[PDB]
Design an enzyme around this catalytic site. Structure first.
Site, PDB file in Angstrom:
ATOM      1  N   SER A 180      -6.733   0.316   5.268  1.00  0.00           N
ATOM      2  CA  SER A 180      -6.341   0.642   3.905  1.00  0.00           C
ATOM      3  C   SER A 180      -5.016   1.398   3.853  1.00  0.00           C
ATOM      4  O   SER A 180      -4.364   1.286   2.830  1.00  0.00           O
ATOM      5  CB  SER A 180      -7.504   1.365   3.155  1.00  0.00           C
ATOM      6  OG  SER A 180      -7.846   2.699   3.635  1.00  0.00           O
ATOM      7  N   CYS A 210       0.824  -1.211   0.000  1.00  0.00           N
ATOM      8  CA  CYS A 210       0.000   0.000   0.000  1.00  0.00           C
ATOM      9  C   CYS A 210       0.857   1.261   0.000  1.00  0.00           C
ATOM     10  O   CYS A 210       2.051   1.213   0.279  1.00  0.00           O
ATOM     11  CB  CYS A 210      -1.094   0.006   1.051  1.00  0.00           C
ATOM     12  SG  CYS A 210      -0.568   0.652   2.642  1.00  0.00           S
ATOM     13  N   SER A 227       4.864  -3.124  11.014  1.00  0.00           N
ATOM     14  CA  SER A 227       4.505  -3.908   9.838  1.00  0.00           C
ATOM     15  C   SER A 227       2.996  -4.153   9.857  1.00  0.00           C
ATOM     16  O   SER A 227       2.512  -4.609  10.879  1.00  0.00           O
ATOM     17  CB  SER A 227       5.247  -5.200   9.896  1.00  0.00           C
ATOM     18  OG  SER A 227       4.781  -6.180   8.953  1.00  0.00           O
ATOM     19  N   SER A 228       2.294  -3.944   8.747  1.00  0.00           N
ATOM     20  CA  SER A 228       0.930  -4.397   8.634  1.00  0.00           C
ATOM     21  C   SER A 228       0.892  -5.915   8.398  1.00  0.00           C
ATOM     22  O   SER A 228       1.925  -6.516   8.014  1.00  0.00           O
ATOM     23  CB  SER A 228       0.160  -3.690   7.539  1.00  0.00           C
ATOM     24  OG  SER A 228       0.370  -4.311   6.288  1.00  0.00           O
TER      25      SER A 228
HETATM   26  N1  LIG Z   1      -5.939  -3.920   3.391  1.00  0.00           N
HETATM   27  C1  LIG Z   1      -5.765  -3.385   2.171  1.00  0.00           C
HETATM   28  N2  LIG Z   1      -5.302  -2.142   2.040  1.00  0.00           N
HETATM   29  C2  LIG Z   1      -5.243  -1.600   0.812  1.00  0.00           C
HETATM   30  C3  LIG Z   1      -5.726  -2.245  -0.335  1.00  0.00           C
HETATM   31  C4  LIG Z   1      -6.116  -3.587  -0.221  1.00  0.00           C
HETATM   32  O1  LIG Z   1      -6.547  -4.274  -1.167  1.00  0.00           O
HETATM   33  N3  LIG Z   1      -6.196  -4.089   1.071  1.00  0.00           N
HETATM   34  N4  LIG Z   1      -5.786  -1.591  -1.549  1.00  0.00           N
HETATM   35  C5  LIG Z   1      -5.104  -0.302  -1.656  1.00  0.00           C
HETATM   36  C6  LIG Z   1      -5.683   0.566  -2.732  1.00  0.00           C
HETATM   37  S1  LIG Z   1      -5.124   0.214  -4.322  1.00  0.00           S
HETATM   38  C7  LIG Z   1      -6.591   1.606  -2.511  1.00  0.00           C
HETATM   39  S2  LIG Z   1      -7.454   2.383  -3.849  1.00  0.00           S
HETATM   40  C8  LIG Z   1      -6.898   1.961  -1.083  1.00  0.00           C
HETATM   41  C9  LIG Z   1      -8.387   2.284  -0.907  1.00  0.00           C
HETATM   42  O2  LIG Z   1      -8.650   2.561   0.480  1.00  0.00           O
HETATM   43  P1  LIG Z   1      -9.995   3.255   0.945  1.00  0.00           P
HETATM   44  O3  LIG Z   1     -10.503   4.044  -0.188  1.00  0.00           O
HETATM   45  O4  LIG Z   1      -9.593   3.711   2.280  1.00  0.00           O
HETATM   46  O5  LIG Z   1     -10.835   1.824   1.027  1.00  0.00           O
HETATM   47  P2  LIG Z   1     -12.272   1.268   0.417  1.00  0.00           P
HETATM   48  O6  LIG Z   1     -12.673   0.082   1.298  1.00  0.00           O
HETATM   49  O7  LIG Z   1     -12.251   1.059  -1.061  1.00  0.00           O
HETATM   50  O8  LIG Z   1     -13.412   2.415   0.626  1.00  0.00           O
HETATM   51  C10 LIG Z   1     -13.372   3.479   1.633  1.00  0.00           C
HETATM   52  C11 LIG Z   1     -14.734   3.719   2.270  1.00  0.00           C
HETATM   53  O9  LIG Z   1     -15.668   4.288   1.311  1.00  0.00           O
HETATM   54  C12 LIG Z   1     -16.934   4.145   1.890  1.00  0.00           C
HETATM   55  N5  LIG Z   1     -17.900   4.647   0.935  1.00  0.00           N
HETATM   56  C13 LIG Z   1     -18.723   3.968   0.084  1.00  0.00           C
HETATM   57  N6  LIG Z   1     -19.514   4.744  -0.618  1.00  0.00           N
HETATM   58  C14 LIG Z   1     -19.192   6.011  -0.201  1.00  0.00           C
HETATM   59  C15 LIG Z   1     -19.742   7.231  -0.584  1.00  0.00           C
HETATM   60  O10 LIG Z   1     -20.653   7.506  -1.402  1.00  0.00           O
HETATM   61  N7  LIG Z   1     -19.142   8.254   0.118  1.00  0.00           N
HETATM   62  C16 LIG Z   1     -18.187   8.155   1.107  1.00  0.00           C
HETATM   63  N8  LIG Z   1     -17.812   9.317   1.689  1.00  0.00           N
HETATM   64  N9  LIG Z   1     -17.682   6.996   1.496  1.00  0.00           N
HETATM   65  C17 LIG Z   1     -18.210   5.966   0.768  1.00  0.00           C
HETATM   66  C18 LIG Z   1     -16.981   2.700   2.361  1.00  0.00           C
HETATM   67  O11 LIG Z   1     -17.913   2.437   3.423  1.00  0.00           O
HETATM   68  C19 LIG Z   1     -15.501   2.486   2.796  1.00  0.00           C
HETATM   69  O12 LIG Z   1     -15.215   2.365   4.183  1.00  0.00           O
HETATM   70  O13 LIG Z   1      -6.546   0.906  -0.181  1.00  0.00           O
HETATM   71  C20 LIG Z   1      -5.195   0.465  -0.361  1.00  0.00           C
HETATM   72  N10 LIG Z   1      -4.862  -0.322   0.778  1.00  0.00           N
HETATM   73  S1  F3S Z   2       0.667  -2.691   3.126  1.00  0.00           S
HETATM   74 FE1  F3S Z   2       0.941  -0.477   3.787  1.00  0.00          FE
HETATM   75  S2  F3S Z   2       0.721  -0.106   6.087  1.00  0.00           S
HETATM   76 FE2  F3S Z   2       2.793  -0.626   5.500  1.00  0.00          FE
HETATM   77  S3  F3S Z   2       3.638  -2.732   5.748  1.00  0.00           S
HETATM   78 FE3  F3S Z   2       2.773  -2.499   3.743  1.00  0.00          FE
HETATM   79  S4  F3S Z   2       3.263  -0.178   3.377  1.00  0.00           S
END
Ligand SMILES: Nc1nc2c(c(=O)[nH]1)N[C@H]1C(S)=C(S)[C@@H](COP(=O)(O)OP(=O)(O)OC[C@H]3O[C@@H](n4cnc5c(=O)[nH]c(N)nc54)[C@H](O)[C@@H]3O)O[C@H]1N2
Ligand code: F3S
Ligand SMILES: Nc1nc2c(c(=O)[nH]1)N[C@H]1C(S)=C(S)[C@@H](COP(=O)(O)OP(=O)(O)OC[C@H]3O[C@@H](n4cnc5c(=O)[nH]c(N)nc54)[C@H](O)[C@@H]3O)O[C@H]1N2
Ligand SMILES: Nc1nc2c(c(=O)[nH]1)N[C@H]1C(S)=C(S)[C@@H](COP(=O)(O)OP(=O)(O)OC[C@H]3O[C@@H](n4cnc5c(=O)[nH]c(N)nc54)[C@H](O)[C@@H]3O)O[C@H]1N2
Ligand SMILES: Nc1nc2c(c(=O)[nH]1)N[C@H]1C(S)=C(S)[C@@H](COP(=O)(O)OP(=O)(O)OC[C@H]3O[C@@H](n4cnc5c(=O)[nH]c(N)nc54)[C@H](O)[C@@H]3O)O[C@H]1N2
Ligand code: F3S
Ligand code: FES
Ligand SMILES: [Mo+4]
Ligand SMILES: [Mo+4]
Ligand code: NA
Ligand code: NA
Ligand SMILES: [O]
EC number: 1.20.9.1
Lengths: 822, 135, 822
Positions: C235, C21, C95-96
């Protein structure tokens, strides 16, 4: 790595027959908690071996591949060790490379079995997903029911194992057979290795000689062994190692002499009928000397001519048993006329020189000095079973054997070497015609096809025509499924059924693994293998053993017999719900809680009072066998048929068939048959006329079958990342190829790919490709041709070879050194 | 050596019938620096011991960065105050949500019907902050 | 199991940035021979930790998942240990769960990476086989060349990563972008997460604020943090853990006060704009108390209304920076008019009570007692980027931020939280129109499609329409290929090209793994990830680090930039051979032997004399960065843009953007924009009108993206064997479902499947499904709707839910306990 956890002295020990080949080698499975271990002192470990100092040769077979750590349904971890039984008569502590890997191929979450099917899988139009067993049964039983109600049984297709060992056995063949034949009552059924409901051994059986008519001890007592269409070092390793080689080495001479005080026993000799010079030829020459091995390197497909020339010669010399022929046979004088072939004609057809033909007869049939005919065991496998007219070759070969009284004498036999183990108990096949199932499917027949314990994408003859048709028909069902939204299971059944009226086919696979069948399957159901279940089976000398359960299956994987019961009970329930008591009644008799129940219902009921018609390798004394009695017998089991049982004696069985001259025919006599020589089939001849190379095919020692386990093994994949084609080096130079180049192999039937493996012993214009494989399927270039009983000539095809290019990686990692030991 | 296994001690925890449903017992295993809990869950689970196959035991050190976790009786979970990892006592220490890369280690208990005794005899999984479970 | 091999004191140690991430946590990779180990004494191991006695909390992060044994191209085996750097400023040794598994997800022949692509794979009409790189290039370049010659670049399609970290980064984005845009010159290119060549951040950029405008230290200095459409504990874990939570706990108060001696700093507070109550909301309440968290649980899609009401209110209260507006902005008075919305109207649309709206403004914008506006960091992610009209939401939000001077002040920023790391250096996009690539493909356009480091079968919006179309078009090519026998590469190119004139599409994937794309792909090429190559990328505060190579790739797997060079050189050679000097010249400039060469050609050339137009996140001072300089920097790297370098100082970079009030627009001023509230899009509203549940979707903490590694991890698959759907318990009871039941989820766009996960915090008529997964693809039910720049409203869809059945095995093995910590 560099150490092993020893089994504790008190570790649990169960019996296990090898999962794989016919030999049925005996093993012990040691099971114990992960955090315990044995001590190095011999009395402080379960092996009884002294690991305080180096062990001598032959003391053990033990590698890390023979160990694992399993995680059971209770979450607890257990060391396992799967090792050969020293006191088993079959193998005397020998393990092949294939059986040696059993521990590694047991299911664990992180090991070679990690991709085992653990739950029902469903292709929901456009993606794989899990589903429940109840949903799977509702969809599968639902379809079967719909098809029965509208099309009758002829809409329901299977290709199913009929064999023994892992993915077969008496419980499993009964379960599947009862389902397919007694309950569903479908004739649209093929076998794992052949595209109709037929036998490999029609001719020999109809002549009165079942194909497993001797003991392995007979290979020890023989003067001469013939190996016809057979590479037994690679394909039946431990029979060859533990029985054949000791004879060739002179270790069994004193036992021959003790049995027969007044008979000469020369040094034993061995004759191979095989177009190809195999590792078995090489190893025989190494052990016995060149002077005690005859390699009859026949032209492909010329077996019938060979045997008719030998039969003609032994009759003309009078090297036959005229008292035997007179008392115990019928049709001899006719066979002499129909089969007449001079040695010169025989030599022209076979390419074998007259001197070699005469020598083979002299070794095998000319009376010894003491008066008695040589004890000549005639062993055959797929070089003739998948040869040029299965029926006619066996007719010709058996004529020779019967005339020379090489059945029913110790040290003799005309036998299959076998493939899988055997373990057949089934109702009769419910049709009155042989049906070429692949052709039917290709032509658009059937609503639902189940691959059960087999993978014809890799192993059909004309496999490319098959895959093409199945993928397309599968796609129609996929396309129809995807228009559904929110449909009940019942609605989905109707959508799929409709798709099959427009060319579609619903495909199910009941398996350990996804396999290549996942490219077409809509449903996959998880099965369990020996050790995850109890299982009975017999080897090439009819020795029945129980393989004991010692661990849980992955997830909800089930014994095939119990999957069959599940299906039967689902269908019964649907019929009862639909108010159709008569149709429900056809699905009675699957109240089974354990595999043992299938054993009691099938094997143990054959020929009993109030039993339905049952065809069983156990025969009518199968009821004397119980799991507890087999346990007491050990890995030695009993040779079928059982003759007696009591508590003090155990199971007493049958060593050799036909020793009193009573054959399995109407009159008790062995029957000679005509064996015409008609050349190659026109379909095969057309390929030979158009294209350059004979595309021989078959087994590699190290690779088991369609490489269902082996595909996940890093050592196997490093050694054979791709299917290989043995090529003559001079042919290689002509095509600018060497070891580790990739070629296209092709003809009118198909196109496939192999890595080039230069082999000096291959003849010019001949090749040899690994069959069945996960990368480069050989069978794409096999023809559709079959004999009268729908037996394919898998060993009969020709094609051209085109260089794709050099795979650098194969050159860096794969050995192209000689596999023929000298 | 020979030996591929750790030399775990055999430590008495209690007799099974003394444990009350969902009332955690504290003990140390395999030494006094390794805090552990045993709990009667009240309902059978895979690998539970005792008369009702429901007694389970764990290392309580978070497998993320080692904070002592606390047993929550209402959820039957172990919760870490460090980075909010939570482990399921009824799924062999499966991580519900969190930052760890390893399930909560299970203390393996022998249950002897003859004596009603529970003895800690091993650990499945690696305890936080240790090269090997047995120091 | 129960022990770990310690790294020896003298073990090799390289730097690695986390593969996954945006946060870009720093790690160290220890590598040493398999048969060596460290001592437990702290000075006898590489970690410097005392393993002679129990370690205290926080002393280490170390589990078996953080260890592996690799086998290198020389056959030698080496222990690796991949652990967080305690002195890296980003993570301070955290670390995550995702990064913590990197060791496990390195390539080894027997581990989680066992199925890594090791060589070119070819679907030769009816079977997967290996092929050579040269044959692969001949076929792929051959096709591209034929398409260029006949159709022009508009026949050649890509979907490619544009991101940083593993499967992106400055080397790789340059390599691919140079290939696609400078050489091939195709406009038919989409991005891994969105179906055109666009930005997530068009509005904020056009208003003069690039989306990564602050430092992580800014989260430490803030009075208030907004997390808008953002689940950062799951995330962006270690930014939340290492930066946000210390602020909420009062650990950063003394640092705020030291920086600003005459400013009040109240206890920090946090505001979440999210329809859903997430783990992040729960954990913020646990840490800060309920009184310092405001969960603005808006109605889905109402963010624009929210911000227009807050902007209106802070303007009416005078809680704005009028001197800032006057000196440094344009269009304020217009935005006051266009965006006007009362708190009553705002409350009716959002569902948020007026008291909560006022409180959020009071906490965030009302002057503190000392006179200064609160330092409010506004952090947003995919809840609004994939929200109801991406462009309009950013317009509304940025208007609020600019009016309140929450850019350019320490402790502020209106920033993306980010997804992947960043690492963009590319030529400009060669078209003048946005093109909806998936729609083009579904409509039958294009000859060849390459998926490169992405898998849109799992991650497209309206993914079911995509898979349907691609599978069918792929089938046409498969069918045409199978009629070939013995064809040269050039003939095969003509066969395939002909098939594409009849609706077919040749599909290639360049990947680490087969993936679901293998269901359609004709060709798959093996890539290499960080540690198998050197790689540069930057995190959410623009901190560029070098990830050092420390092991070999599997087989012939290659860095993506070098795959691009391979393709470009094959094309150049074809053109040279065909006598087409002009066309050959377009494929110059890929003389690259290592990834570093791609760094020199792209990142380091941006803005230099006689360079072509290059768009780089390094800017025109990127040339001051070298691999050797990054090595010396450590896991701390430097924040871009670099401002100076010398030998004695190192790389000196930029903490925060816009601190002098000069924005990235024509006039240097930040530009306010109109933000109309127009409700939900009619396509989405129609789904909401027809169907019962809002189908929210997104991340799980433990699962990374399409689960391309996680699918092979036994722990991950035991935890999440199927994609889960969080549902309200009362909704559950109405559908007779509970934890571990499987449901179909469906609408007009598609049908998919999920296991039920009852979650008390889910609102009635709302759900939450894991996106992108390997078992139950969420995207099947997302609509085709996109904003003006072709940004999908992935979080905007409604559908119905139907029970399939109970998965008893899920009930036995999967926890359905709460993931919201209290
Ligand atoms: N654990 C983990 N972490 C990751 C990833 C992974 O696959 N796993 N992927 C990475 C990537 S590429 C990305 S893009 C990021 C994304 O990370 P975030 O964007 O933080 O994660 P999401 O779960 O896609 O969605 C965020 C929130 O949007 C809310 N939501 C839904 N509809 C709406 C709306 O209309 N308005 C608002 N305000 N909120 C809304 C949902 O309830 C959700 O909690 O995470 C990154 N980090
Ligand atoms: S998934 Fe993201 S929170 Fe850290 S250990 Fe990896 S950069
Ligand atoms: N060209 C050519 N083609 C040939 C041959 C030849 O010589 N030349 N030989 C033929 C011969 S002799 C044979 S035997 C066939 C083999 O043809 P197949 O029977 O298609 O191949 P096998 O590998 O035996 O198939 C066993 C399958 O069952 C699965 N399996 C294993 N254990 C179990 C279990 O307990 N239950 C279930 N349900 N599934 C299980 C395996 O994963 C695998 O998919 O090939 C034939 N095809
Ligand atoms: N290592 C290993 N052993 C196995 C198996 C395996 O997959 N791996 N499979 C098992 C099974 S199911 C079976 S059926 C057996 C197969 O055992 P075999 O039949 O022993 O094995 P194959 O390699 O199919 O073929 C035997 C020989 O037939 C020859 N041959 C080809 N055409 C002709 C011909 O026209 N006439 C004659 N006379 N010979 C010809 C080939 O050169 C070859 O050496 O092996 C079993 N054992
Ligand atoms: N419904 C819904 N859909 C969404 C979203 C959502 O919130 N909701 N989110 C969107 C977002 S923000 C994103 S980021 C996308 C993700 O969509 P994708 O980009 O399709 O998904 P990833 O899982 O990131 O794709 C990475 C792929 O590259 C491979 N790979 C890994 N490393 C390398 C390497 O070094 N080289 C190459 N060539 N391949 C490599 C992996 O094995 C895998 O197939 O999903 C989007 N889709
Ligand atoms: S070990 Fe197995 S593979 Fe055959 S030779 Fe023996 S039965
Ligand atoms: S120390 Fe337990 S969740 Fe981090
Ligand atoms: Mo066979
Ligand atoms: Mo993203
Ligand atoms: Na083919
Ligand atoms: Na779907
Ligand atoms: O993203």
């Amino acid at each position: 790595n560099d150490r092993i956890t020893l089994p504790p002295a008190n570790a649990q020990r169960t019996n296990m027959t090898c999962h794989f080949c016919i030999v049925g080698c005996g093993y012990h499975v040691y099971k114990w908690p992960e955090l315990q271990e044995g001590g190095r002192a011999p009395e402080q470990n379960a092996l009884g071996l002294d690991f305080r100092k180096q062990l001598p040769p032959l003391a053990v077979t033990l590698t890390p591949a023979m160990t694992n750590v399993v995680t059971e349904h209770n979450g607890r971890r257990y060391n396992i060790m799967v090792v050969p039984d020293k006191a088993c008569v079959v193998n005397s502590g020998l393990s092949s490379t294939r059986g040696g890997k059993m521990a590694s191929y047991m299911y664990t979450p992180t090991g070679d079995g990690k991709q085992r099917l653990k739950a029902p899988r469903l292709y929901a139009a456009d993606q794989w997903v899990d589903t429940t067993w109840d949903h799977a049964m509702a969809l599968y039983a639902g379809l079967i029911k719909k098809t029965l109600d509208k099309d009758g049984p002829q809409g329901v297709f299977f290709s199913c194992f009929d064999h023994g060992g892992a993915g077969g056995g008496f419980e499993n063949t009964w379960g599947t057979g009862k389902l397919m034949f007694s309950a569903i009552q479908t004739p649209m059924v093929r076998i794992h290795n052949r595209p109709a409901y037929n036998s490999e051994c029609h001719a020999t059986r109809e002549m009165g000689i079942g194909e497993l008519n001797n003991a392995y001890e007979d290979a020890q007592l023989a003067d001469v062994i013939w190996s016809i269409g057979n590479n037994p070092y690679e394909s039946q390793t431990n029979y060859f190692l533990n029985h054949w080689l000791p004879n060739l080495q002179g270790a069994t001479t004193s036992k021959k002499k003790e049995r027969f005080p007044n008979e000469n026993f020369p040094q034993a000799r061995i004759i191979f009928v095989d177009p190809r010079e195999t590792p078995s030829v090489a190893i025989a020459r190494h052990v016995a000397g060149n002077d005690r091995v005859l390699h009859l390197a026949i032209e492909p497909g010329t077996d019938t001519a060979l045997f008719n020339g030998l039969f003609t010669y032994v009759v003309e010399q009078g090297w036959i048993d005229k008292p035997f022929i007179e008392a115990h046979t019928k049709g001899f004088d006719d066979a002499v006329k129909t089969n007449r072939l001079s040695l010169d004609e025989c030599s022209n057809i076979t390419g074998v020189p007259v001197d070699m033909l005469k020598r083979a007869a002299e070794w095998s049939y000319k009376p010894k000095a003491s008066g008695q005919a040589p004890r000549t065991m005639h062993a055959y496998e797929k070089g003739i079973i998948w040869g040029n007219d299965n029926y006619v070759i066996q007719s010709a070969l058996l004529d020779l054997v019967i005339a020379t009284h090489n059945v029913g004498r110790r040290g003799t036999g005309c036998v299959r070497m076998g493939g899988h183990q055997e373990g057949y108990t089934r109702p009769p096949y419910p049709g009155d015609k042989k049906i070429y199932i692949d052709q039917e499917l290709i032509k658009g027949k059937g609503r639902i096809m189940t691959w059960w314990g087999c993978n014809n994408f890799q192993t059909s003859n004309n496999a490319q025509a098959l895959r093409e048709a199945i993928l397309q028909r599968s796609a129609i069902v996929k396309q129809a499924m995807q228009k559904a939204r929110g449909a009940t299971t019942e609605e989905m059944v109707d959508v799929i059924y409709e798709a099959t009226q427009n060319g579609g086919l619903f495909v199910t696979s009941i398996n350990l693994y996804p396999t290549k069948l996942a490219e077409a399957a809509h449903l996959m159901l998880p099965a369990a293998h020996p050790g995850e279940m109890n299982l009975t089976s017999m080897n090439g000398e009819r020795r029945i053993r129980l393989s004991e359960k010692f661990m849980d299956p992955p997830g909800t994987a089930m014994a095939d017999c119990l999957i069959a019961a599940r299906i039967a009970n689902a269908l019964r329930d649907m019929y009862q719900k639909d108010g159709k008591a008569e149709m429900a009644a056809q699905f009675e008799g699957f109240d089974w809680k354990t595999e043992e129940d299938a054993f009691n219902d099938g094997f143990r009921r054959a020929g009993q009072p109030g039993a339905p018609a049952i065809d069983s390798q156990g025969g009518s004394t199968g009821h004397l066998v119980t799991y507890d009695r087999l346990r007491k017998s050990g890995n030695n089991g009993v040779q079928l048929p059982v003759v007696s049982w009591d508590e003090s004696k155990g199971l007493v069985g049958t060593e050799m068939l036909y020793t009193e001259g009573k054959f399995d025919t109407d009159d008790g006599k062995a029957h000679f048959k005509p064996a015409p020589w008609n050349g190659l089939p026109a379909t095969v001849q057309q390929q030979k006329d158009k294209y350059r190379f004979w595309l021989n095919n078959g087994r590699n020692n190290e690779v088991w079958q369609t490489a269902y386990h082996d595909q996940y093994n890093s050592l196997m994949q490093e050694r054979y990342p791709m299917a290989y084609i043995e090529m003559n080096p001079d042919d290689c130079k002509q095509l600018d190829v060497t070891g580790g180049d990739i070629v296209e192999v092709y003809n009118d039937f198909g196109s496939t790919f192999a890595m080039v493996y230069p082999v000096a012993e291959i003849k010019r214009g001949q090749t040899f490709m690994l069959f069945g494989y996960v990368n480069g399927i050989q069978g794409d270039v096999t023809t559709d041709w079959t004999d009268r009983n729908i037996i394919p000539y898998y060993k009969g095809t020709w094609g051209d070879i085109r260089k794709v290019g050099s795979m650098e990686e194969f050159k860096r990692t794969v050995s192209f050194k000689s596999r023929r030991f000298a | 050596a020979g030996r591929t296994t750790l030399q775990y001690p055999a430590t008495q925890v209690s007799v099974a019938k003394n444990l009350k449903a969902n009332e955690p017992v504290s003990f140390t295993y395999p030494d006094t620096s390794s805090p552990c809990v045993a709990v009667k869950l009240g309902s059978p689970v895979p690998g539970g011991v005792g008369p009702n196959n429901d007694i389970v035991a764990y290392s309580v050190l978070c497998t993320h960065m080692g904070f002592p976790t606390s047993y929550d009786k209402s959820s039957k979970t172990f919760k870490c105050p460090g980075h909010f990892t939570e482990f399921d006592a009824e799924k062999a220490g499966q991580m519900i949500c969190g930052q760890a890369t390893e399930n909560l280690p299970r203390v393996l208990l022998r249950y002897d019907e003859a004596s009603d005794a529970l003895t800690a005899v091993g650990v499945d999984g690696l305890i936080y902050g240790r090269q090997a479970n047995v120091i």
